[PDB]
Design a protein around this ligand. Sequence first.
Ligand code: ATP
Ligand code: MG
Lengths: 232, 49, 57, 114, 114, 229, 50, 50, 50
Amino acid sequence: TLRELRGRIRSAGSIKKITKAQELIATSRIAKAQARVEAARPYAAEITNMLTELAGASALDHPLLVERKQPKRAGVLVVSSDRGLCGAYNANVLRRAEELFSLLRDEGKDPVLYVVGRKALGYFSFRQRTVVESWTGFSERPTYENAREIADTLVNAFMAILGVDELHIVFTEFRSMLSQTAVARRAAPMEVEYVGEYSFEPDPETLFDALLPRYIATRVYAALLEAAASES
Amino acid sequence: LADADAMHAKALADAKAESEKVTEEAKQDSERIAAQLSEQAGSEAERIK
Amino acid sequence: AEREAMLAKTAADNRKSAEQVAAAQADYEKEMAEARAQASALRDEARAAGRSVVDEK
Amino acid sequence: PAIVGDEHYRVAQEVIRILQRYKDLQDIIAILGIDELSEEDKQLVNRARRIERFLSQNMMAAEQFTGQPGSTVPLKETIEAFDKLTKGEFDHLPEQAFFLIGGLDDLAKKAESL
Amino acid sequence: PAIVGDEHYRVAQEVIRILQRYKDLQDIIAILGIDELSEEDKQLVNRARRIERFLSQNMMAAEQFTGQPGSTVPLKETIEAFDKLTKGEFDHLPEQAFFLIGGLDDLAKKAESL
Amino acid sequence: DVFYLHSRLLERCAKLSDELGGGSMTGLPIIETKANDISAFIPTNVISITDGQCFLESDLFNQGVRPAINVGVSVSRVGGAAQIKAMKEVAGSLRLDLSQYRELEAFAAFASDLDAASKAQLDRGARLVELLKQPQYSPLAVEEQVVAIFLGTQGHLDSVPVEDVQRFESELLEHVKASHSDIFDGIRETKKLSEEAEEKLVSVINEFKKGFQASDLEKESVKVRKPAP
Amino acid sequence: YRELEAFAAFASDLDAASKAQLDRGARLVELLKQPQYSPLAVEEQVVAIF
Amino acid sequence: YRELEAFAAFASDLDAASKAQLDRGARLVELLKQPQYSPLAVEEQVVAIF
Amino acid sequence: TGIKAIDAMTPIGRGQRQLIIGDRKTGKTAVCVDTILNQREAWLTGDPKQ
Ligand SMILES: Nc1ncnc2c1ncn2[C@@H]1O[C@H](COP(=O)(O)OP(=O)(O)OP(=O)(O)O)[C@@H](O)[C@H]1O
Ligand SMILES: [Mg+2]
């Protein structure tokens, strides 16, 4: 018995060392991810500003702004970690994803899944829910290329194959280092909100068309950075 | 389309034939398993006697 | 209008040719599975009868 | 199985299997928690907690301690309830519902209370 | 190194180091998992498993245990095989290729069989 | 001298030479280990006195492994010499294969992804474990046992799902016993799987597998800089 | 070094001073290795530790 | 409360019911605190627990 | 023995000693009694060599 207890003590000490080391390194990556969120914010602010200007100089007939006549299929992009030891992160994200699925079902739309991260992919594979496409290997440290690819795929699925009449993104926001809540946002079709009381080259409508996909890519990128900070 | 319709008809005919063959084989099985279990019953009864 | 109808036909029919090939395959598989399930049920009933006669003896 | 019946023995063995798997996973549950297990094992551990708590019962002799009167659960109801628990028919109910409950009907009552 | 030669000693000590590091890591692996290790430590764990299984041998007197006949591995062949294992020239083969196999030729035969 | 007690007792179990009539006495001593500790004093004494050990572990018994032979600890030093040629051939390395499977399962418990070889090993081991499960008072004749182990070792269970393996054995062993008893008779009389018998058994298994039923919120909004639509 | 050894896997995220300490220790440990029956006079030890 | 506090020590957020439980327990524990050599008559005990 | 596990992995031969060792209620007596029962077919042969 004493031999087993000594071995258990050694194993627990080793696990304690590893876990404390990863706690400190997770603090470091929290700092880095929050720094990246801050760095990416100004681009999002300015692109939002010029998107508002273009909308003010646009007819607002772009497909990504008009709800389909009879939406029957809605896509969902679930953002998750690609490695474990993050506690309830993936569990919370997928619980919110299932709640969104239930809400969509009550609204008559069957969800079609896009997944970012390996853990959510395994979670959905266990319950035999089909995933159209999934990306993995960057949730710890996402780049803009990954977000651009995700947004392009989602936009292509929206424009269309069967396609989807709507699309949501489920991801964990970083409100504070103490709180990380899972949320779901509709990324298309984008509603138009009126605020209250410029020249264009070559014309404001083509610029709006070229910029809306860019805006969706930027928002997907911001969601990925928020998810990375929350995961850390 | 004509060839595909003929393929469907052939598939249905072959499915009927294969189901008949499978049912015949399963009936022969059922019979043999029943005979084996009856022999086991006789053996158990004689052991108890 | 005739070219139009010919177009319609070709399109749909080639669609129904694919659909009928898939239907042939799927129906063969489904009927084979039903036959296997019926055979398994018959053999299970045979084993049940065997166990019942064993218990009766 | 020759004495208590096939259904009773099967349910008992499945419950024991789930609880043994939970005990084997304790080594990881203690350090990392439920979050890091495989999904099959996660579901198993959830219904294992519910089974472990459902085996609790409000006994008559416990009244003097708790005030709540004791409850009797016949064998048939116990077998049915634990068959449902193992099959996962109650994985949506909170674990708190299975404390000292003694019965399927009273389980539904407490779940409605929660 | 003054008796068996520096070549033998270096391979023996590398094998001992790899197996000791694997023994230390077995605590982390069983609970945290394999993917949470360092890349170097992960590759070392693969090497260590293969080295442990290559230290096994189909012994002549153990034909009754395994059925297959025994084997005699020359010392120089052993040194070369374990030098390669520690250097990773056999890291791409499956683990079972090294199990109860008496030398490099038999290792290649088993790898081609698997 | 407790060791001299158990040794003095057990060492009298022996296979006598032909000059002494060729008799035998097979000893199955039973030892109750406290708290699954096979490293205690009397357990280790009796293990060192005996020719092999079957370690029945409560954890395995609860997991479904009945009888609960911890394959890794258990061993029979007579081994193949105490088996008919058929079972010696179809189960030559079964114990070591199962021990390796248990080691891999313990190691690969948390592996996110596994090599194809390791996954195949895990599947084969799980099917073998299910095959080795056996209800109480349900003995199998040696020929039935060699056919059952043939299903697992040779990979005929690879396609069958794990949860159904137990049934697949039983049903098959019924079918043969009811329809192809020549295989059992050949194994029993000749004590070996002849090539013809092995081919016939493979054909029977492949035709049987055909007829076997396996159980298997907020909105992203574009702000427009005007007061009304 | 023995306190920081757990970070050999994630050195990339360590502070520069911590990385320097880890690298220094990984070499001091080698520095203290010594073959059998090969004692070093005190001056050689002084130079080695230097 | 003794287990809800442990759960909340690492839970990202708590429901309203869990918050109420935590806030009631953190005050009950403080209420049961009592200085040394200061026993309370039963009437005062029942009032304090009330 | 009539048990697949024992006859396949740890075969018991005539004249050798197989220690059935385990905790309470693990199946030791079950294994031994099954071994004894499995010898009825050999007994009915009437052949002392079997
Ligand atoms: N292979 C098996 N399959 C199913 N149940 C089994 C099996 N082997 C044993 N059991 C059951 O498990 C329990 C084990 O009883 P058994 O007397 O065989 O164990 P034991 O280890 O000899 O115990 P003890 O030390 O108390 O005598 C009994 O319920 C027996 O019916
Ligand atoms: Mg007993």
